[PDB]
Amino acid sequence: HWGYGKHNGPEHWHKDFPIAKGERQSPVDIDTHTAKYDPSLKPLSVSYDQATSLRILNNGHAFNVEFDDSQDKAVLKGGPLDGTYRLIQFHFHWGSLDGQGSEHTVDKKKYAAELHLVHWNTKYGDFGKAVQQPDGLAVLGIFLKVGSAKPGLQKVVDVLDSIKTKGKSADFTNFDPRGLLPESLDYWTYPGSLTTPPLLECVTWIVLKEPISVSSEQVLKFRKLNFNGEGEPEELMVDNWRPAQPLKNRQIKASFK
Ligand SMILES: [Zn+2]
Numbered sequence: 001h002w003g004y005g006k007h008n009g010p011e012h013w014h015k016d017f018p019i020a021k022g023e024r025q026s027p028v029d030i031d032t033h034t035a036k037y038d039p040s041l042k043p044l045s046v047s048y049d050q051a052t053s054l055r056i057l058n059n060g061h062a063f064n065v066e067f068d069d070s071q072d073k074a075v076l077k078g079g080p081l082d083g084t085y086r087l088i089q090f091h092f093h094w095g096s097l098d099g100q101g102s103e104h105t106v107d108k109k110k111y112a113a114e115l116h117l118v119h120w121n122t123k124y125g126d127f128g129k130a131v132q133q134p135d136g137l138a139v140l141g142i143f144l145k146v147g148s149a150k151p152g153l154q155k156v157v158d159v160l161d162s163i164k165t166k167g168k169s170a171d172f173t174n175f176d177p178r179g180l181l182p183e184s185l186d187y188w189t190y191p192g193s194l195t196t197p198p199l200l201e202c203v204t205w206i207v208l209k210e211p212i213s214v215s216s217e218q219v220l221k222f223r224k225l226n227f228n229g230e231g232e233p234e235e236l237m238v239d240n241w242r243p244a245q246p247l248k249n250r251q252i253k254a255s256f257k
Helices: 151-163 216-222
Strands: 044-047 053-058 063-067 075-078 085-094 113-121 137-146 169-171 187-192 203-208 212-214
Touching: 053 151, 063 151, 075 113, 085 137, 085 216, 137 216, 151 169, 151 216
Parallel strands: 137 203, 137 212
Antiparallel strands: 044 075, 053 063, 053 169, 063 085, 075 085, 085 113, 113 137, 187 203
16 A cells, blocks of 8 residues: 555655646745745634544554534634635654654755644535645644654643554544644745645645744654554554655745745
8 A cells, every 4th residue: 555665655656646746746845035925915814712622543654633623613714725724633744863754844954743734625515525626625734843842742642652553543632732833823835735645736735934842752752653553563653754846836935024
């Protein structure tokens, strides 16, 4: 199947998912000097007060914290977006070492990890129909660097022992995703795709400029997860990131001067 190893990783994905070589693939390098400030962007609105987390799941590629998206409980609006996008899950990509792990890069800089908060456009009714649309999804991306601990991350780190292997899940109610956000909502935005198979070109990317800091100990617990299932040979879940893809005919916009 697909994965991140030598034999089924990003260089091989195109054989089953030919859109991998398409015109609006993600991630990309964000060249900060070439991004254009757009005064037309409206402020970003992150409204997570009534988010309802439900469960955390190791899917063999990352872990997802899942939300109740049957009502507008946690939504993203404004910025480059038309309409309302509802939070359905978040997950991370991370490295085997602190010098790598992010999917997007900033002037070729790789961060230790990258958080993706995934939202679908409520005009399409549910996630599955949204990923048949060029404006179906909005993913809020946040970089992680290693430094001081992020207190709002610690409940996630502490449940990882219960979902070590592919297919395990655990209750994960009453988690507040606002505790994963940096102070500033300054961002870059561009049209792109899912960064894993099926690599569908449905995503408005919104990448925050300000990273959050997490401790060495917190990201080390990410690296103890497993890609394999229970009872199978252990393969640590590390380096589950896709490298930067060609920008092609795209412009990255900045919300800030
Ligand atoms: Zn992701």
